[PDB]
Amino acid sequence: MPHAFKPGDLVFAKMKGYPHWPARIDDIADGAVKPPPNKYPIFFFGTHETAFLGPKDLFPYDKSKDKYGKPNKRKGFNEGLWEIQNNPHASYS
Structure with a gap:
């Protein structure tokens, strides 16, 4: 059975006006702005x-x-x- 989303999970993410888009759940870095x-x-x-x-x-x-x-x-x-598909967990900084 599915769990809650966790950092590292790969998804297609939908935003208004854009196609479903290849994405991942990110970690929040120490000292970085948290999400709502x-x-x-x-x-x-x-x-x-x-x-x-x-x-x-x-x-x-x-x-x-x-x-x-x-x-x-x-x-x-x-x-x-x-x-x-090829390097979903790499640093893209």
């Missing part, structure tokens, strides 16, 4: 952007890759697909 309650820090592959999202916007990667893991015209998306 019930939100997780989402790191977006390819763009390397962070946003704060709740579970309704987070789709587990394995279950969803067949639907959402296809090339997309949007800036950074295809890079993002490579990242999530």
